[PDB]
Symmetry: none
């Protein structure tokens, strides 16, 4: 029949350019953030002040999240003043809407080794910390209690089983966190909340921005990986705890 | 002993049905997912020779991210985001099919189903509902089946109605998993509730005459989804059984 | 005080049971005024109203009330004529007022036609033989639309007949309600109870015509009692 | 530190109990001012107010407060007169203020008539014998309305009688709340109870409608025996509410 | 590989535990500035501020924050002075800023009085003895309000005392939250952990007066250990 049908049929008769297809898919794949863009942004706008500012912003992200106004009305006076000051200074937003967009949580994810260290030190101040986690498992790794830990899970220099175990241990926290903050998820299967965070996690782990060798070294320094390159008992127990539901 | 309007209602109900005009009305009014010819014509007329490549990029986007252009554009590589925005403005791509003229990436993908499905098979690990999800339900779920375009490739002719039924069930396994995995509305949703969420686009795609049945059959045989005898492969059969079994 | 005194005395009055019953009926739920719809259609469309109405009813049966959404998802000719008719008759998608003209209200305004057309168009219905055959043998196709409630007689047949027919139809109403909108049987029954009782109890469509029609379609026998298929369908709903 | 000192000194004050109870009573939940409603109706309608009010109450009992919406789905005559009365008395669909006159408030202002009418019009009620009979046999029809709380006596009967009546009525309040409030069908017994607790106790403890008349009326309808204790239907309904 | 180097180096910095803790405290949840509330009340109301504040607190205890909705649902006199006070002090129904003055914040600014009044007004509380007796015998009435958290001392008593008191009170917080907030024990615990700890860890209201007050009310023994009612309530909270 139509000319248009012949075109569709012929279109499906073309050879696939595999390399170019893979390139397109990678170009279009889920990306949580562009860390390099964010760091460039911070360093260029804040000057030498950018480190201090960034640390404070990260403390805010860790303890209160992205809701700048709503919290700011809800803290100490100096804290509020400074939070708003940083807000105007850096063009902070409460919601991640664009590739250029800078949220506090994105800042925290942009500097994961610092953020996770700070989170461990400020465990008692976390929205989902030891209070929630010790109930599920004994001695959950404090470095794991934040959105940035995904960036520190290595895909190289370790076995695939190690990577998997770490991802499950972290998945315990991701699940509990998602449930504790989302309206949507009060009663939901392990699998849907898992689906609510699968893309950011796989993207975070597979990202090439933060070097794997540094990840491995850092995990070893915190005792989350042994000197042998396999997960600590806390990691294994947490992983088992996530698998069991 | 009845009112004027009542008499009119009764007389109206005493008329003979013109069966042919009725079937015609039903067909005119029946569900139609898209006009592929309209989409292709618009794309080709707007893009000229670049329309082929551009379309391929758009289809990769549809396969991996869906229709939500802006939101997804915020969560991807720089090159991808750039070309995506460029193509949207260039072709007037929209995120929702609200009109027959609305051009969504998914409608584009569905307009070129053999290519879309081949690309889907090639881009297996990048799909939202792919081998990771499918392997848990069944062994070797056909990768060409893992996309919204496969429905258009199911033949109603050149095969038994049983073959068609089987293929539709095998594909329904993927449709079920996909619907549950992306359509947040479908929480706690029964097998039948989610089935009904895709019953119409699927039946419309299969019975559609835009894409010729013989080509469908030939293509399915070439991809080994149909055997040389014209019946579903063992993998297709297992997928169908897996769907019937829940 | 004096206001308490007035309240008490007010409560000392005898109830006028019949005047009360009329007030209740006047104020009771009413899905539509069929005479109003038909009159408006005829006045607006002129002689063309018959053809237009039949087309509109086919749309109501197969796609429902959502004109814009459906017009985006149908053939060109279908969409064009649908939008044209919307403009022509001022069709709306939701009934908010007594004057609101939705496709479903039209279909319900011409129930003997609508149910006949629905039977002829079994395969195009959202909830048809595919769904019904799973539940029961030989479900009457005329029952498979929103218009059938109006054809259930309250007179010229026993009340057991009326109840039975209402249960048989309740099977379809149940399935339809679930597929177009998991709640209890009674909850969903409650989702359609009022439009149904209103449709059955309406005096617009004459009972004798209803019974004659049901007889002609073999839903009631020459004897005036439900067919075997009707009895079984009713049992199928009583039985959940 | 001066503010802290002030805070401490404030908490070192002696409590004036009568002053506190006065404030609490002044601030406690109040569903409506019936005298206000009746006075407004009578002053506005004149001699016609009785007829008008009865029609309004039938509307409240059968359709609720949504005047325009309901006028959309009713007979022509019903719609015409409903809108006419709405216009005439300045009826509103929602109680935002003490002066707001809603149909349900009108019904609650004249509870003995409202409840008698509800019993007579049981088959027309949104939550009537169809629903209630499933839970209990012969649930008192006078209880099947928003006005019955006002008819439960706090005087002239035992405290146990009052409690029993309140539980029996709570069966209907529970069912009603569940059928009309969209939110509450996945809501526990206690959760739905808390949704109507305050209006109910305000209705029972209210002093507008005299207790002796309540008792006499309940006796006349056989909800109370000649002995002043709840009938078997009331007792069974109460048990049914306690049992969930 | 230029930005990555910066990212790694940033994570190679030393943590300043003290400045970090300082940032955390600065950014942590804080329910109110009692000094600002009291200063505004006293300066606006003059000699009258005491009368006003008490009335406002009774309103907070019995009705909460929703002034406009509640004013339509109370006695005429109550509604009138409530509206008058509302305008007089610029009272609002929701705390959006440190300057927002809600009735509940007023109540929490004067916790020893509020808790005393709450005990005296036991029968008028939304979650009072009726609810509490079902969970435990002799639950302390001073605990049946949002202000009690501020009176739990962190000093001048053993750390064990603080634990039992906070758990005993957590029982009321649980019941209250369930009754008004719109569901496991720990999940709802998370709904009130931050305000509870902020109230308990805040230093505006001196610990020695807290302890003294608790002794006077018999929640603490003469030696400074929890009453039997407190421990039984605590056990009752930890159990399920």
């Amino acid at each position: 029949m139509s000319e248009w049908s012949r075109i569709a049929v012929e279109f499906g008769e073309q050879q696939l350019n595999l390399t170019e297809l893979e390139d397109f898919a990678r170009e279009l794949a889920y990306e949580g953030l562009d860390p390099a863009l964010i760091i460039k942004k911070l360093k260029e706008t804040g000057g030498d002040d950018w480190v201090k500012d960034t640390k404070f912003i990260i403390v805010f992200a860790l303890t209160r999240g992205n809701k700048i106004v709503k919290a700011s009305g809800k803290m100490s006076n100096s804290g509020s003043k400074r939070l708003m000051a940083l807000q105007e200074k850096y063009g902070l937003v409460e919601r991640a809407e664009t590739r250029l967009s800078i949220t506090p949580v994105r800042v925290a994810q942009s500097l994961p080794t610092w953020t996770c260290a700070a989170a461990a030190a400020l465990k008692e101040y976390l929205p989902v910390g030891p209070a929630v986690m010790n109930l599920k498992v004994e001695n959950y790794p404090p470095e794991m209690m934040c959105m940035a830990f995904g960036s520190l899970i290595p895909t190289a220099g370790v076995s695939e089983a190690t990577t998997k175990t770490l991802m499950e241990a972290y998945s315990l926290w991701q699940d509990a966190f998602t449930k504790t903050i989302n309206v949507k998820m009060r009663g939901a299967s392990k699998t849907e909340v898992y689906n609510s965070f699968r893309d950011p996690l796989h993207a975070a782990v597979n990202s090439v921005f933060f070097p794997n060798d540094v990840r491995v070294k850092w995990l070893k320094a915190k005792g989350i990986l042994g000197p042998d390159g396999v997960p600590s008992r806390a990691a294994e127990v947490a992983a088992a705890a996530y698998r069991n539901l």
